[PDB]
Amino acid sequence: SPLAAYEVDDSTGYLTSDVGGPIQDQTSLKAGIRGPTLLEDFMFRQKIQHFDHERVPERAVHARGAGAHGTFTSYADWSNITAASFLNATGKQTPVFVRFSTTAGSRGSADTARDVHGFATRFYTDEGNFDIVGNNIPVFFIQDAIQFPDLIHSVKPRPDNEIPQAATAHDSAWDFFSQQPSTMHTLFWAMSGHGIPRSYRHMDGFGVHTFRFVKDDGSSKLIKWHFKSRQGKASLVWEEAQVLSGKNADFHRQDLWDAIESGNGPEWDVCVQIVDESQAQAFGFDLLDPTKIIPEEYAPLTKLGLLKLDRNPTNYFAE
Amino acid sequence: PLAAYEVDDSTGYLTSDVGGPIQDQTSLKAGIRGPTLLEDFMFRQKIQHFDHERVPERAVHARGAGAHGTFTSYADWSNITAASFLNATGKQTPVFVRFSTTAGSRGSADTARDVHGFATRFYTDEGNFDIVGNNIPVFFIQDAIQFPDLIHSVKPRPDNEIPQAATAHDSAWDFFSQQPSTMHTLFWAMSGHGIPRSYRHMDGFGVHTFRFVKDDGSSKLIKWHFKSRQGKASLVWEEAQVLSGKNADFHRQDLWDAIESGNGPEWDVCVQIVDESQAQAFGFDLLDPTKIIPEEYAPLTKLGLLKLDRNPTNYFAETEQVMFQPGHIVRGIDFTEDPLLQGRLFSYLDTQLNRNGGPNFEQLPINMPRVPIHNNNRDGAGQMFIHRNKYPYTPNTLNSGYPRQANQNAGRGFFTAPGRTASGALVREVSPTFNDHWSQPRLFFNSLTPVEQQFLVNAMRFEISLVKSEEVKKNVLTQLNRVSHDVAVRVAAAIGLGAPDADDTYYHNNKTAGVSIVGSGPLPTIKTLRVGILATTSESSALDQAAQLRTRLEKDGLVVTVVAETLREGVDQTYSTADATGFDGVVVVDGAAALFSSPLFPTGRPLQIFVDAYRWGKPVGVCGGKSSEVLDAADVPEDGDGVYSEESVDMFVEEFEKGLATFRFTDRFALDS
Amino acid sequence: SPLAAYEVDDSTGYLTSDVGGPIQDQTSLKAGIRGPTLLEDFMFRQKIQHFDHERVPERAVHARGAGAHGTFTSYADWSNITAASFLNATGKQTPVFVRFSTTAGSRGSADTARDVHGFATRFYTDEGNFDIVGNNIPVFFIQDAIQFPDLIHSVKPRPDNEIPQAATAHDSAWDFFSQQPSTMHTLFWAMSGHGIPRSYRHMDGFGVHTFRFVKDDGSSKLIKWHFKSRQGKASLVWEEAQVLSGKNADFHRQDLWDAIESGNGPEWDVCVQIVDESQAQAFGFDLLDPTKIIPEEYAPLTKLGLLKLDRNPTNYFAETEQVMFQPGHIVRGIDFTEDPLLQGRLFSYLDTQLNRNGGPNFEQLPINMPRVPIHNNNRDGAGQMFIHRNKYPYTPNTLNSGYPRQANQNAGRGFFTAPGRTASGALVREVSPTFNDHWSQPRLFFNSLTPVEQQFLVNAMRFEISLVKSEEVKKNVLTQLNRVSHDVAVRVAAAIGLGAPDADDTYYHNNKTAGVSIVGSGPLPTIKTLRVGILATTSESSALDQAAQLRTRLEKDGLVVTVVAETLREGVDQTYSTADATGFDGVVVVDGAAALFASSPLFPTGRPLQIFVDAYRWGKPVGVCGSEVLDAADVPEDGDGVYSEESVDMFVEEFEKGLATFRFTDRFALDS
Ligand code: HDD
Ligand code: HDD
Ligand code: HDD
Ligand SMILES: [Ca+2]
Ligand SMILES: [Ca+2]
Ligand SMILES: [Ca+2]
Numbered sequence A: 001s002p003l004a005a006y007e008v009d010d011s012t013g014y015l016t017s018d019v020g021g022p023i024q025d026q027t028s029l030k031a032g033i034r035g036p037t038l039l040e041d042f043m044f045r046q047k048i049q050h051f052d053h054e055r056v057p058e059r060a061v062h063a064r065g066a067g068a069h070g071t072f073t074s075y076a077d078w079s080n081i082t083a084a085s086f087l088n089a090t091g092k093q094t095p096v097f098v099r100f101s102t103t104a105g106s107r108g109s110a111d112t113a114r115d116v117h118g119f120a121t122r123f124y125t126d127e128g129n130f131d132i133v134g135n136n137i138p139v140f141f142i143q144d145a146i147q148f149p150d151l152i153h154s155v156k157p158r159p160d161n162e163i164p165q166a167a168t169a170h171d172s173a174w175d176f177f178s179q180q181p182s183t184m185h186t187l188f189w190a191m192s193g194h195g196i197p198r199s200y201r202h203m204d205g206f207g208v209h210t211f212r213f214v215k216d217d218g219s220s221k222l223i224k225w226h227f228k229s230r231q232g233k234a235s236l237v238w239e240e241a242q243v244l245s246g247k248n249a250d251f252h253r254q255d256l257w258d259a260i261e262s263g264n265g266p267e268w269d270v271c272v273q274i275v276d277e278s279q280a281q282a283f284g285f286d287l288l289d290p291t292k293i294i295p296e297e298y299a300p301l302t303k304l305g306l307l308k309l310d311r312n313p314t315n316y317f318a319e
Numbered sequence B: 001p002l003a004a005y006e007v008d009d010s011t012g013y014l015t016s017d018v019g020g021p022i023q024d025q026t027s028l029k030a031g032i033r034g035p036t037l038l039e040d041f042m043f044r045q046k047i048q049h050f051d052h053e054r055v056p057e058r059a060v061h062a063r064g065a066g067a068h069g070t071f072t073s074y075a076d077w078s079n080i081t082a083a084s085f086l087n088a089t090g091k092q093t094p095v096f097v098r099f100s101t102t103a104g105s106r107g108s109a110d111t112a113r114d115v116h117g118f119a120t121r122f123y124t125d126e127g128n129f130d131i132v133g134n135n136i137p138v139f140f141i142q143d144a145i146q147f148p149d150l151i152h153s154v155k156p157r158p159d160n161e162i163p164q165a166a167t168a169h170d171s172a173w174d175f176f177s178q179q180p181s182t183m184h185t186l187f188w189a190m191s192g193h194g195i196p197r198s199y200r201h202m203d204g205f206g207v208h209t210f211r212f213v214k215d216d217g218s219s220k221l222i223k224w225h226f227k228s229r230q231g232k233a234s235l236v237w238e239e240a241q242v243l244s245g246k247n248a249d250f251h252r253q254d255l256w257d258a259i260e261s262g263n264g265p266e267w268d269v270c271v272q273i274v275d276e277s278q279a280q281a282f283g284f285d286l287l288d289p290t291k292i293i294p295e296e297y298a299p300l301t302k303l304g305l306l307k308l309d310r311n312p313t314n315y316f317a318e319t320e321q322v323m324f325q326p327g328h329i330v331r332g333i334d335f336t337e338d339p340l341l342q343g344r345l346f347s348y349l350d351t352q353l354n355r356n357g358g359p360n361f362e363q364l365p366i367n368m369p370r371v372p373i374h375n376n377n378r379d380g381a382g383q384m385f386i387h388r389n390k391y392p393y394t395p396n397t398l399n400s401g402y403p404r405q406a407n408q409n410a411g412r413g414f415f416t417a418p419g420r421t422a423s424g425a426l427v428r429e430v431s432p433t434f435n436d437h438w439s440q441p442r443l444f445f446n447s448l449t450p451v452e453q454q455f456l457v458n459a460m461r462f463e464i465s466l467v468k469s470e471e472v473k474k475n476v477l478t479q480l481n482r483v484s485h486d487v488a489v490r491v492a493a494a495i496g497l498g499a500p501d502a503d504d505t506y507y508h509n510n511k512t513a514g515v516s517i518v519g520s521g522p523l524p525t526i527k528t529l530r531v532g533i534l535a536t537t538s539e540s541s542a543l544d545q546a547a548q549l550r551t552r553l554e555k556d557g558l559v560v561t562v563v564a565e566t567l568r569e570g571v572d573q574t575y576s577t578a579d580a581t582g583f584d585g586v587v588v589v590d591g592a593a594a595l596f597s598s599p600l601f602p603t604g605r606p607l608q609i610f611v612d613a614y615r616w617g618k619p620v621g622v623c624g625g626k627s628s629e630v631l632d633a634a635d636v637p638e639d640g641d642g643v644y645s646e647e648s649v650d651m652f653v654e655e656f657e658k659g660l661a662t663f664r665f666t667d668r669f670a671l672d673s
Numbered sequence C: 001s002p003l004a005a006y007e008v009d010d011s012t013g014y015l016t017s018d019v020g021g022p023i024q025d026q027t028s029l030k031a032g033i034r035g036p037t038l039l040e041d042f043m044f045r046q047k048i049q050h051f052d053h054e055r056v057p058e059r060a061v062h063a064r065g066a067g068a069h070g071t072f073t074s075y076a077d078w079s080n081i082t083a084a085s086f087l088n089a090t091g092k093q094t095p096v097f098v099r100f101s102t103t104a105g106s107r108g109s110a111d112t113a114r115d116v117h118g119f120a121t122r123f124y125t126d127e128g129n130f131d132i133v134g135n136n137i138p139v140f141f142i143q144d145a146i147q148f149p150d151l152i153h154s155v156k157p158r159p160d161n162e163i164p165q166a167a168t169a170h171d172s173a174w175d176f177f178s179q180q181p182s183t184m185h186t187l188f189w190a191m192s193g194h195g196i197p198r199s200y201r202h203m204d205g206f207g208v209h210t211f212r213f214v215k216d217d218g219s220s221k222l223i224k225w226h227f228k229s230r231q232g233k234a235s236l237v238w239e240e241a242q243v244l245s246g247k248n249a250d251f252h253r254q255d256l257w258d259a260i261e262s263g264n265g266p267e268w269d270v271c272v273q274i275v276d277e278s279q280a281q282a283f284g285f286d287l288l289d290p291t292k293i294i295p296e297e298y299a300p301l302t303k304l305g306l307l308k309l310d311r312n313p314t315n316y317f318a319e320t321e322q323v324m325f326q327p328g329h330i331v332r333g334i335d336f337t338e339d340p341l342l343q344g345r346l347f348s349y350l351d352t353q354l355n356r357n358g359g360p361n362f363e364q365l366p367i368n369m370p371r372v373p374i375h376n377n378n379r380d381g382a383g384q385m386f387i388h389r390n391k392y393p394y395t396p397n398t399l400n401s402g403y404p405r406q407a408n409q410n411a412g413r414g415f416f417t418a419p420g421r422t423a424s425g426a427l428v429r430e431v432s433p434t435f436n437d438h439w440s441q442p443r444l445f446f447n448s449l450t451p452v453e454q455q456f457l458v459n460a461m462r463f464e465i466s467l468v469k470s471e472e473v474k475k476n477v478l479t480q481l482n483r484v485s486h487d488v489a490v491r492v493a494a495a496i497g498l499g500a501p502d503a504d505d506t507y508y509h510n511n512k513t514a515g516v517s518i519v520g521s522g523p524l525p526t527i528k529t530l531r532v533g534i535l536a537t538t539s540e541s542s543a544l545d546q547a548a549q550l551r552t553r554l555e556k557d558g559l560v561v562t563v564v565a566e567t568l569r570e571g572v573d574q575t576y577s578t579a580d581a582t583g584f585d586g587v588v589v590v591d592g593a594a595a596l597f598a599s600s601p602l603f604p605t606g607r608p609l610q611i612f613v614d615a616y617r618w619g620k621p622v623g624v625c626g627s628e629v630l631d632a633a634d635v636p637e638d639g640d641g642v643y644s645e646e647s648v649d650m651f652v653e654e655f656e657k658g659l660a661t662f663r664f665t666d667r668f669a670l671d672s
């Protein structure tokens, strides 16, 4: 794994510069014991330059979040419905990394804000990396990507004073929702307990969009991804979520970290609804429209495989 | 003030950044249900902009808020400094200030326990001058090279990035206990100074000794102290925690609102001035940033008034982008050989390259000076200037020798204090004059009132009880014990360890003025303080009582919120959104007594607001004459200090306003025996 | 205009930091007069940090180039064919900035490399900036933008050793050309004198792609942009270009700078060929194919307006280095076509400015700003120079009263896609069969050159291909050249010791087209700015008099005259030591200097004579005014473009006709 090869062990040894020269890093070099610090102190400048440059821009959305490593195991040879190599054999294992998140808050905002949550999953397959960048709610606020900055500006803090943090509870957000009626479906989801899940482990993941599964013979079917929690669905109540935001801003990332350390890594059945191309408009709405679900009564779930998260990261920044 | 750079979008058709009129609501597609086209430049320019909106947060003090204002000098200070902004009675200079916490990221809560930033830029007529200070006058460490150690230890553990905006974890207390220089700042941070009621109710300190330098070359040693005209005030910890959840924006909102209401905050900008010969005369080394000069040894001199009175137009462009530097220095000021200050000078010029992404960060509007620039700096990413001079080297004849060198004797140049010298070996050694890490933490502790000392003990009990390593907890007790055996015993009691035997080497009974918050007396003004009036829509008389109270309270500049079950004319907030952390005092109108179950708010909400306000020390009361139903339900004694009951609205308000100035009724908090 | 506002004057005043604090910058602050430098020296660190960060990435292609400001003036109200506002009125003037460039070389490489040249023009219109990002050659090497990194990697230096600089004369390039036959047309242009123009002012500009003109009624027509030089077409000869690359790497930028300063700013007629949408495939090729020209016989040029460059920049870095062109800079009245090369360019030029500028606010640099108000909800980003007053930057809103308003075909003079455009069919990664003829038009181009011009093209190929090490690559090259012309393949093969493959006549023909020949385009319409070197001596008062009388006679006609002698003095501009024939368009020896042509510590052995002999070998008009000189030089007196007159005035009348003729091609040997 590319990760093991890049691990650096510092449990023994003498301090070195980044080019392997043994040094110290506790006292600046000075002209006399009560003197001014010297420009020639390369130990000081290399250490402080690194520190000065430690930060990178946070993600433009989903800046607040936490990740874990695990495995995906296929239940079957799915060649009959897709050419995807990671799905081509019973028992086939593929390493995964998942990051969960809120959407609107900046990187130090509270886990238990009311919001849509991200659920992004990378499958490091033997025919390349495959990402499903999903949310815990199966429908999105807007019908065209060109509108994304409008939605996001409206829910993020007002830009004169940057208030309020990680909240749709302000004029601009409700102005946008009320002027752009496509938002109603996701708004209803976000105003339900799905806006304040009990943990990352007690929510589902959805690809949201219709995608295609394509067979080697070139034929295709339309699919929706649904990752179904084996832990069950659970929410906070709002008054509790507000107190929690203050008492433990890290509640979800801690809950996940602890579940993994205790040998209780969370699991989801990775599923799809699969329909024919001819059914794009058969269900009373258009399958190209990301504000619509296919009700399970019209298309049942097929279970493709098991996703399990069971290893925490070594360095949060790096991973 | 930055009017020249403002862009108005109150009219007009949408354009690209190159002024072509466009639309930005629907992608261009091959057919009505088709794929989006690569030739859609409207789409790509808008999304590329959005994709690149974010810049790195500051490495420290990432969470903060700013405002514009004015500094006015009280005198001609020519006799102690050549500084131009200080050279005439009433001389005005524009300022911009940013306040902040230190450890938390962007979006973390204002009301975390932390050291707070107080960074002030003076846009002077001889260049920008920044004083990049904190609300605590001493720093954790004695050498700038240790800054990444301190900051790594207090920021979240780097495997899981937990916990946010908190020193309550093993690594922070490991560092504090292994690096005893940290004791003084630690005691300040564990006091009420770690949880100020607002940015307007805290002071600002330069921390380091600097120099004032006269035009004749003579110098004096100085400390900067910005003294709040609003008074000093803190939260209680249990209130700070709830506020962190109910309103992460509490400090920035408080500042924004104070400015909008014509109540812009003020400070007297002051210095302690001492001679060069007094650098080691006070029983410690003035080069040591872990030490204060007790005011009994050097009084404060008031130089001028700092008032903040205008909010930014765009937070990102102004507050997020402002790039402070202690190297932004002007003639009349100089540095000292404080090894913490010395290294800062390097860091703040370097770190703006990370934030800005390129070298021309001094060109952003908020960073520009208000005088002309004449230099041979050229090119670089994002170069906004078009330089005429095609011979940007010195010495030249082809541009007639311009720009001219500025120095002590020509052009009002900056100059290093000419009496400064260095001697001795080139060493990476700490001066033994820095070795007493404990006497001043004890001085501070001794200077707090008894309940203030209890609050500080309780903060330590809270944080240290969360440290998992029993070796770290013991090492912590070792250090606290060197400051005070009593502190160590009392903290130990909460963590079920025994304190080590008294070690009296640094114990003493001296005290100093001006560091206590509890002891600083009633607030000098109650304007902007918040009063929540709890009422009901059930009784039209409760609303009438609330309206009467509003009129009488607003007349004195208090911010009044009437709370009821539902909104209507006269009601500002519903019970569902109301919380005691939203108010500095709470009044119930006696017509609403019955509320003290509904689908409109959580069970017990009206009573909980009142009980919380009481337990956190706020003035509370019932107006109207019938008070026992409410006071009994809340288990509040009618005869309590800071508890009011009057039928007369006028009399109620008179008494209640005395309580808002007292601010906290400390007699409601238990003390260790 | 945004430009004047950002000018900074440093002709007076004391040195200050970037925050206005007066300082010095000549000596570091030290602990003692022989001591170490102090970290607290903020004067030193701000100065050196700026220096350390002066450089930005060079452009990925066209890194070497030079720009100027000017004006475009419309000749008419063109509303009959386009809604474009800058074209809506007779005499309507629009400010422009133009950058010219080579393509392959890095930013310090020589102007006179053999290459395709860029000609990028920005019109700062009253309806937004409009850029036409063109070249001096009307066709491009490849038919799909996705292939651009392949082309460019192949022509740029080999990536193990980064050799050779600014040259297609290496195996990788010819490997690519020989494997990707679409390259043949542009290859023939680049191997002609078009690859080595005499100056930026003596070449044309082409948009290359078919674009659309769109009327306010929504109807559209197809167009090609052609900027036609009012200075005439002229080239260097290859040997000359090689010498110039060493003697004066700045030759073209110097020439442009100097022409502008002297009040001789270059001019072009901005022209279009216009044809109907129904003619997309009517000319025997597909107008979506960027490797094809429309012959002027099929579609004449319509003159739209005048482009003039007449003001040099103030700061090269801030203006020329930082200008960031995009074909995505389009205005109402113009639209794109489905040319797969143009389609992908639209993506690249918006993306690549992030690399150059290091942040997303590159349109805020003064050179990139428009001249009209900007109204949009783009916010933040590194280097944000605006303070936005609209605190509700989202659409739809009520909190900012629904502003800004959406602009489109009906409202607010919005850009709109030509509404007649459609797409139909499978989603495919397939090349249209209509693109498959890669050889007929290169042959048309070749046929259209004069015999000596054909020889120069054969000789450029002989030069470059002889430097290809791989015998298999050389064979593969002959295979492709042979499909254009058997004779070309035969003549190239003779220089490399290979046999040409047998004639394959599938694409051979004898058709010609007008307007592509340099040699055939006739004498230059103006000789203003052309350079005359007068080779004189300080050893004879008579020689300096002769030179001075000639100077005044030539200078009045706008010629740039350099008098050369052994050492400088009044009347002498340059020494023999620094002079070279590549410095002049014509060379005259004053006969009083006869002795210098027969050793000196002041110049290299044989220098005066070698300047005259080089100038003659390179085709330039050469003269002796007063021969022993022509004998020493082996220059026949009766030769065309060789002048011998004792009279000054008769010499100058004759010589100036020679400058207009420009090159005397009878001096170059032809095959057979
Ligand atoms: C056109 C813009 C746009 C639109 C319409 C969307 N997003 Fe997105 N999304 C971004 C532009 C973006 C982005 C700016 O590109 C981010 C920021 C960080 C990153 O890697 O991509 C991102 C991040 C991002 C992340 C964080 C991944 C991580 O943990 O690092 C998730 C989970 C989502 N998005 C999920 C969605 C879902 C489920 C969408 C609707 C179906 C969606 N996004 C629409
Ligand atoms: C050598 C490293 C170093 C050391 C010892 C310090 N700092 Fe610092 N400080 C920085 C390195 C730094 C920095 C990394 O350079 C920051 C981050 C963002 C910036 O502009 O500078 C910064 C930011 C920063 C800010 C935020 C300014 C703003 O609002 O934008 C304040 C108020 C302070 N610091 C105050 C202090 C005080 C009172 C110190 C002790 C007397 C101190 N710093 C020591
Ligand atoms: C898909 C990639 C791609 C393709 C197919 C082309 N180019 Fe390009 N071109 C770029 C990608 C690019 C670029 C990497 O985006 C550059 C580098 C610097 C810049 O601003 O854009 C560029 C620079 C650039 C410049 C320099 C502009 C200036 O002076 O700053 C000119 C004149 C051209 N190109 C002209 C053309 C012509 C006439 C083409 C074919 C008709 C062409 N390019 C195809
Ligand atoms: Ca708002
Ligand atoms: Ca629920
Ligand atoms: Ca820890």
Ligand SMILES: [Ca+2]
Residues within 6 Å of the ligand: B191, B192, B234, B235, B452, B455, B517, B518
């Ligand atoms: Ca307190």
Ligand SMILES: [Ca+2]
Residues within 6 Å of the ligand: B414, B415, B416
């Ligand atoms: Ca000095």
Ligand SMILES: [Ca+2]
Residues within 6 Å of the ligand: C158, C170, C171, C172, C173
């Ligand atoms: Ca090669």
Ligand SMILES: [Ca+2]
Residues within 6 Å of the ligand: C192, C193, C194, C235, C236, C453, C456, C518, C519
């Ligand atoms: Ca030629």
